[PDB]
Design an enzyme around this catalytic site. Structure first.
Site, short mmCIF file in Angstrom:
data_model
loop_
_atom_site.label_atom_id
_atom_site.label_comp_id
_atom_site.label_asym_id
_atom_site.label_seq_id
_atom_site.Cartn_x
_atom_site.Cartn_y
_atom_site.Cartn_z
N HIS A 5 -6.75 -7.07 11.70
CA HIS A 5 -6.92 -5.67 11.32
C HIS A 5 -7.04 -4.83 12.60
O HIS A 5 -7.41 -5.36 13.65
CB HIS A 5 -8.20 -5.56 10.47
CG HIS A 5 -8.43 -4.20 9.88
ND1 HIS A 5 -9.05 -3.18 10.57
CD2 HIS A 5 -8.13 -3.70 8.66
CE1 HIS A 5 -9.11 -2.11 9.80
NE2 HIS A 5 -8.56 -2.40 8.64
N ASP B 132 -6.02 -0.35 1.32
CA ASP B 132 -6.83 0.13 2.44
C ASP B 132 -8.00 0.99 1.94
O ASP B 132 -8.41 1.95 2.60
CB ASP B 132 -5.98 0.90 3.48
CG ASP B 132 -6.32 0.54 4.91
OD1 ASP B 132 -7.44 0.03 5.15
OD2 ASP B 132 -5.46 0.78 5.79
C1 LIG Z 1 -12.92 1.46 10.30
O1 LIG Z 1 -11.71 1.01 9.75
C2 LIG Z 1 -10.72 1.90 9.45
C3 LIG Z 1 -9.48 1.39 9.08
C4 LIG Z 1 -8.44 2.27 8.76
C5 LIG Z 1 -7.08 1.69 8.52
O2 LIG Z 1 -6.09 2.44 8.59
O3 LIG Z 1 -7.01 0.47 8.26
C6 LIG Z 1 -8.61 3.64 8.82
C7 LIG Z 1 -9.86 4.16 9.19
C8 LIG Z 1 -10.04 5.62 9.24
O4 LIG Z 1 -9.30 6.35 8.52
O5 LIG Z 1 -10.92 6.13 9.99
C9 LIG Z 1 -10.91 3.30 9.51
MN LIG Z 2 -7.99 -1.06 6.97
#
Ligand SMILES: COc1cc(C(=O)O)cc(C(=O)O)c1
Ligand SMILES: [Mn+2]
Ligand SMILES: COc1cc(C(=O)O)cc(C(=O)O)c1
Ligand SMILES: [Mn+2]
Lengths: 335, 335
Positions: free
Chosen positions: B174, B297
């Protein structure tokens, strides 16, 4: 009878070669020094390259004829004049541009040309851009991603983009190696170069340009990106989706259009180094067929495979004609 | 009656939350601190996010029910436990994995789970990976791109990948914010996050893994990348073409397969955050239908649009079933 105009075709000139040969001996920490030593160095790993870049009317034209290519749109090869000090870069840009005009004039049905400039000195670069457009009447402009490890969202470069917008010339933003802001991750496995670094460096530059609002300041700019748009066409949905967060929580400025709308309005792409029918079809689908141009990336890529890629593309003949040369004729004002 | 298994669905647990709240007050220079302060900080710009990440059986399940989603494959939300010191990260991974296993066991027809680990200590991480596979019997693993500003080509992490390969568990890599190697270019316009930095950070990690020959050392590894493969599917032809130069002039090691062949053999992708039918079709074409999985997501993206994206995908029903859940059931051992 398909009209083929190749849009990312590198060339060099003796005064630039000599300056880079000298530069190759310095302790410059730029990641471009890998390429510069390989091609321009005293013990070059790629000793034939200067000759192939310098040649226009010999092997290059012979290859064009044997493959049925009508034209090359020529550009001073990366890293252009951007590694030199400002005075040196300004001088050499003028010289290279005069030589480009001279080269094109010897065979104008077979070659068109992009002028370049030294954005190390924005005011002087603006004057040279005007000279390229109105005095030399070249077909467009080329620059190689970053200058001085800054990207083109930086207000330092506003006089450059003001002049480019006013000139009506499209600007081809060609890659160079990752800037010092990001080069640490590109030191291994040859990733400094076309295999990965080039695309990350150039696409990040272009994304910064869009998100900074450069295309609200200068809405008539036309930017061209090679390598199937440095993959920006693939990211359009996410660039758009996440823009709300960027302006809400991330301090990004509010824009008049969506990121993808700037990409379709202000950018076009070429197929240099991405001879994939699937990627071509994807790009035509999401950008429109007026926004995609064919290129070879000679002499860093061979002509025959690039030509056969477009001649065999599973797209209708009218769209193929646009991609092969029609779009380039429009964007780079080629008669 | 399409079976929908969402494969990139973030969750958190109180012990991790408390540790991040404390961490938000430190002078850590990691670019992830932007997100960490926004979500876990004392004065959070995104105050509802902890509650949404923590919730499994309330709103999350209600939303799954109202949209006809069969399952969420849960993962500890980025940055996981990777920002902490080794002792703290190791301790918290164990707790978080126990809680994940308990969450799954409570509603095993609705939730599957990925275990995580703290690669700050590769020896201890190897032991936790084994525990996740054999004792907890979780469905796979997750890690958030870099650890300690190093990428997974580094031999430092070999005990981790040896353990992952032996376990047979797929590893979802990720995103997290760009590492210190590259973060200078991602400090503006919200580019630290999903709009750009996440993709560049994660794809560069994966490309280093491939070019370093990690998948010759551990050929049975399965790696999963979200966000339509972090655009690597788009770059396959160029990655392959430029590999000869990389190994000839660039000191890249000779590999048994082509880069794109490692990508198809050892990787699979998900559609998280890229709800584009065009990008989906491109990916199915170049990777094969067995290598693409659906995701939402959540809670960073809403469920309804992600669900309607796959339900309306212009692909045959058997391929839609594979993407919507069949591939996930195979890759992540879900009955
Ligand atoms: C903290 O983990 C995150 C993952 C994602 C993603 O696109 O997988 C997007 C955000 C975000 O939009 O801030 C945060
Ligand atoms: Mn994500
Ligand atoms: C210095 O200019 C270059 C351009 C390209 C390109 O992909 O546009 C490739 C190489 C290269 O293969 O080294 C060099
Ligand atoms: Mn080129």
């Amino acid at each position: 009878s398909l009209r083929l105009i190749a849009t990312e075709e590198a060339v060099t000139f003796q005064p630039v070669v000599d300056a880079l040969r000298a530069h190759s001996r310095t302790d410059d920490a730029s990641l471009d020094m890998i390429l510069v030593r390989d091609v321009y160095g005293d013990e070059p790993a790629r000793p034939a390259m200067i000759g192939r870049l310098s040649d226009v009317t010999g092997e290059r034209l012979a290859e064009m004829d044997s493959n049925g290519v009508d034209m090359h749109l020529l550009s001073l090869t990366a890293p252009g004049v951007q590694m030199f000090d400002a005075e040196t870069g300004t001088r050499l840009a003028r010289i290279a541009n005069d030589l480009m005009a001279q080269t094109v004039a010897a065979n104008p049905t077979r070659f068109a040309g992009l002028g370049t400039f030294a954005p190390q000195d924005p005011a002087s670069a603006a004057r040279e851009i005007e000279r390229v457009a109105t005095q030399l009447r070249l077909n467009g402009l080329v620059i190689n991603s970053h200058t001085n490890d800054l990207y083109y969202d930086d207000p330092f470069f506003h006089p450059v983009f003001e002049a480019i917008e006013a000139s009506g010339l499209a600007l081809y933003i060609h890659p160079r190696a990752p800037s010092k802001q990001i080069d640490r991750a590109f030191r291994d496995y040859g990733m400094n170069s076309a295999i990965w670094g080039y695309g990350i460096e150039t696409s990040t530059n272009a994304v910064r340009m869009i998100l900074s609002g450069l295309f609200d300041r200068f809405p008539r700019l036309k930017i061209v990106l090679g390598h199937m748009g440095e993959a920006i066409p693939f990211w359009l949905w996410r660039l758009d989706y996440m823009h709300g967060n960027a302006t809400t929580f991330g301090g990004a400025p509010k824009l008049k259009l969506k990121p993808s709308e700037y990409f379709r309005r202000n950018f076009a792409i070429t197929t240099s180094g991405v001879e994939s029918h699937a990627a071509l079809r994807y790009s035509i689908e999401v950008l429109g067929p007026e926004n995609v141009m064919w290129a070879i990336d000679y002499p860093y890529q061979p002509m025959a495979p690039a030509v056969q890629f477009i001649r065999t593309a599973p797209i209708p003949e009218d769209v193929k004609a646009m991609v092969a040369g029609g779009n380039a004729a429009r964007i780079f004002r080629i008669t």
